[PDB]
Write a protein that binds this DNA or RNA. Structure first.
Ligand SMILES: [Zn+2]
Ligand SMILES: [Zn+2]
Length: 56
DNA sequence: GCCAACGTTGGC
DNA sequence: GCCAACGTTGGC
């Protein structure tokens, strides 16, 4: 694997899923269909996440 | 065995 | 070159 948490940015410090972004809504637990399978947009690490996963 | 989400690629 | 889509995998 590649480490995807720097651990010290506002995204990594965030506690809970936002429950409103495209990735959250897609989670089965939020009622989505699991077609995207990514972590909350607002929990995507600002240093280590692929840039396409950051908020837009 | 489940499952969050990583990591690869077919199709553009 | 890009990413939507989903197969995979580490942690539990
Ligand atoms: Zn979210
Ligand atoms: Zn971070």
């Amino acid at each position: 694997r590649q480490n995807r948490k720097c651990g010290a940015c506002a995204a990594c410090l965030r506690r809970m899923d936002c429950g409103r972004c495209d990735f959250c809504c897609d989670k089965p637990k939020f009622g989505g269909s699991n077609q995207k399978r990514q972590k909350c947009r607002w929990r995507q690490c600002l240093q280590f996440a692929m840039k396409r996963l950051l908020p837009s």
